[PDB]
Design an enzyme around this catalytic site. Sequence first.
Site: not given
Lengths: 342, 86, 115, 115, 52, 52, 284
Positions: B8, B10, B33-35
């Site tokens: 999700d 890095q 962060s993709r969240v």
Amino acid sequence: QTGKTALAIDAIINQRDSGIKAIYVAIGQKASTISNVVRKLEEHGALANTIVVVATASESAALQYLAPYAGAAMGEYFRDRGEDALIIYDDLSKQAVAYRQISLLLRRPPGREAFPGDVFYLHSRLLERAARVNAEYVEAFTKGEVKGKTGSLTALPIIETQAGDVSAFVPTNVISITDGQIFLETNLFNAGIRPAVNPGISVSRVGGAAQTKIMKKLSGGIRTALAQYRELAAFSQFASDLDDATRKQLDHGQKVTELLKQKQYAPMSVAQQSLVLFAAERGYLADVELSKIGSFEAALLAYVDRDHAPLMQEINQTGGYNDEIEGKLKGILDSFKATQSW
Amino acid sequence: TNVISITDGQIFLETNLFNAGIRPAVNPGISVSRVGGAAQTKIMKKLSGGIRTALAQYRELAAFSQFASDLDDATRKQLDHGQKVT
Amino acid sequence: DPLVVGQEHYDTARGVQSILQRYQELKDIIAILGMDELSEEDKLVVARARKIQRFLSQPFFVAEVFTGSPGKYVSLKDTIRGFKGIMEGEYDHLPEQAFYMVGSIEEAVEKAKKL
Amino acid sequence: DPLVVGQEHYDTARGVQSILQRYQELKDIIAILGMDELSEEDKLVVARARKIQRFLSQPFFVAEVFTGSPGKYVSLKDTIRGFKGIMEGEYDHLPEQAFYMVGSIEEAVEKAKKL
Amino acid sequence: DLDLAKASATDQLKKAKAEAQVIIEQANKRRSQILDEAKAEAEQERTKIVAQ
Amino acid sequence: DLDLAKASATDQLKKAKAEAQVIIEQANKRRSQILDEAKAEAEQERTKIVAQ
Amino acid sequence: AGAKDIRSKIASVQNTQKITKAMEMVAASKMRKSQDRMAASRPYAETMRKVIGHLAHGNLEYKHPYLEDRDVKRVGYLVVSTDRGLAGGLNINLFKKLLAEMKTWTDKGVQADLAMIGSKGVSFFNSVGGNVVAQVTGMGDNPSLSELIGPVKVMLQAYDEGRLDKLYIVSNKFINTMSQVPTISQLLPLPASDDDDLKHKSWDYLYEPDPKALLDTLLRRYVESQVYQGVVENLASEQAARMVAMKAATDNGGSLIKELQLVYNKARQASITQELTEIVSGAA
Ligand SMILES: Nc1ncnc2c1ncn2[C@@H]1O[C@H](COP(=O)(O)OP(=O)(O)OP(=O)(O)O)[C@@H](O)[C@H]1O
Ligand SMILES: [Mg+2]
């Protein structure tokens, strides 16, 4: 085509009166090249000091693969007697290619770059035969016929790189095995620096213990100074103002670079090399304009050979160095540079 | 490549930052962060947008840091801010 | 790390790393553009870095056969003091060649006087 | 090799090789900065090297079906004389186009009259 | 001065005249060295070639 | 008087130095002829002996 | 070693490009600042030119060495040049135009000599070996008139005493942002065309102490102002020429990076393809 063979046959030619016997092993060369080399060794006095071992490009891969080992066995005869031998293996990489042919035809599993894995054991067992043996080993081998003499075999293997790429499998193995390397490279050779010896990546792991004391004293300063000159010359390349330590360094290094060029088949004795290096270390070159540095050297060797030959005999025989030697060389440079013309 | 594709987000740690002294060594603009802000508390979510944009402005200005004496003061303020956040 | 080395040593090593890191970026500018394009502070770092690079050299008394020169031993205490001195101003005025294969900082001044 | 070719040929070939090598060393400078940043001797190496590269060109008799212009046969005496003259700088007043696709150095000066 | 200008005029004439002769004489020493060496080694070559 | 005398010295020295170089060129021409003729005589002995 | 160093080489060119992209903007800002300074200097000189016009071409007409016509036996120049590199061919263009005229008077058998501003001109003309009598260097940005009083006073001293019969200024002119031109223009004697008036010199000035001291000092100040203004206008032209040179360096660097990347992707792909041929071949 960078002068790999030229260096090694000149090293043979110069042994003509040193007492060191010579072996030249030609692996995978074309037979007319071996005609030409032998014809140059015979044009000098060198062939009567030399053994020539041949496996031309027509001969079977087994004959090429064995040819270095057959040459070493001849050199070991002199080494175990208490005599010195110098062995040149021309193109150890052609020995590896023949060994790869043999291994793939025998269906042995290919390792990296398709060579067999044991190819390190091929070159390392070959090259560890070149050795200096203590007198006790000679006495035992000769059963007391020869006593008190230490025998030596010196090996000069040759490797061809494809594009300066040292990372190939056969070059990395042979660089691991040997006691040093001389790098010859195309950019210097095209620039006219011949012999094209790169001072930075070349090194001797024996170093000064191999030299005569006069050369040891003079030459130690030269090689690391010359390497830093090339770094300095890069850093300087667009800066208009040089501090005089730098400006001096940016000149001395060019004049030393010019001094180390030398024509093929023209070897120089120890005293002749020492005298010319003394002129560079003790600053006598500094005022002479750079293209004249070549003529300066030629005239200095000519002058000293007519007028001062007793010192040349003293240095060549002894290799000695002392305050009177420094004084006599200083007197010769002072006298030459006043009295003569380049 | 496989684990970059699976995860999700890095955190890239870099050696140049660690040598230069940014010892937590996290490299912004390549870390992600993709969240994102759903993960984050209200106070941190409110405040952290300033840091994110300040360091973006800092990266482009860092090329002018060699000769930042002759700059628009707005730029001089931004540069002296990117450095102090860093 | 400070829990063994103490802060005195830790700060000195991290300092030297930061200077040599900075200089490696500056060296890329110089080679094409030249050194005049730097800030005078980046010029100063390029100077004191290029000195520290040479001061880390040391002749070994197992290498006299290669060098021809006497080998040197240094205490840890004297090593720390020397690098602090290049990182600050005390030796801004010595040449680069005055550091190369010297030994202690206390004799780098002597090679400068000889140079 | 000087023994078989003799010295004048050998020296001319090594001169051409040295100038053209040095032009390769400058091209990475020129590619980014442009030529104006070169030294006035470096500009003279480039100005000669470019002429040399053109004078190496030649019209072939078998190529007339492509180029149209008639083929040339050039003696070894005319080739070493031409390159030795260019490197001595006798022709530094001619443009580069004067040297392109000319059989001999006399043909270059006649081409230069009409540019 | 009417005397230092005379003294220096003879001083340069003396030094210059001696060096010009020394240069040209040792050019003859070099010539005769080169000729002597060539005249000798011509036979040192031939005496190798007949032994071959 | 002093200035003229110093210039006359430098002429005399430089002229002698240049004459020494053409003296040496002619000894090299002789040397290169003598050694080439030695090789070209020696080969015409060797071929004669081996043909015998 | 494509797997190893071509990767870094790209990074070095990328970093170099990011720097030259920034230098183009620095130069474009200094060009603006110099352009304001250039405009302020014009009104002082233009006012002083009005005063010497009024006394020179006034109804009572005066005589002065710097103003009067003289025939030529020696010709002099003073030359402005940069102390910094880059900036394209700006200096060399001006220097070869100067050598063309300096050769033209030399063909007339007329001796020439130079006064020099900036170290590039010092180096080029020492390499020519043209006679240089005076030098000033190291002004940078914000040059000052105080420096330049030296160079002019010794050229003035040469001209008045006959050692010089003509004097010129050699400099580039800032036509606009996009274009600049190398030029030579005369200082001594005063070249300017005559002008005519009624109110001026009819409602004539009270002079103190006298009208001769006030013509001498006024001319001395005018030619000083002319070379200060030329120095400033060449400085504006330096920043313009550097701005353009950094555009080319930035585009050239951007053109190289893409060719290094196509070369790298070939090596990246080829090495994957080789080592799988080895692994499968070794699974005999
Ligand atoms: N010191 C030198 N000065 C001038 N020319 C030289 C010198 N050494 C070698 N050469 C020339 O370089 C060329 C190649 O030399 P050599 O044949 O030794 O290279 P090589 O690396 O062995 O080539 P190959 O890879 O084909 O074996 C020859 O023309 C030779 O005359
Ligand atoms: Mg070979």
